[PDB]
């Protein structure tokens, strides 16, 4: 299930995007 979050500010968006990509990379390997 996918959800969408609206974020205000380019810098804030960049931060959350990096954190989300980091979590997805962790899962793809698992650990």
| Residues contributing to the site for its own copies (CB under 8 A) | 1-10, 12-13, 15-26, 29
Task: Read off φ and ψ for residue 5, nearest 5 degrees.
Answer: -120, 130
DSSP 28: H
Token pair in block for residue 25: 């990379």
Cβ 25 to its own copies shortest distance, Å: 6
Cβ 16 to its own copies shortest distance, Å: 6
Q: What is the rounded distance in angstroms from the CA atom of residue 29 to the CA atom of residue 15?
A: 22
Cβ 13 to its own copies shortest distance, Å: 4
């Amino acid at each position: 299930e996918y959800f969408t979050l609206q974020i205000r500010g380019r810098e804030r968006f960049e931060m959350f995007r990096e954190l989300n990509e980091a979590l997805e990379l962790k899962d793809a390997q698992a650990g």
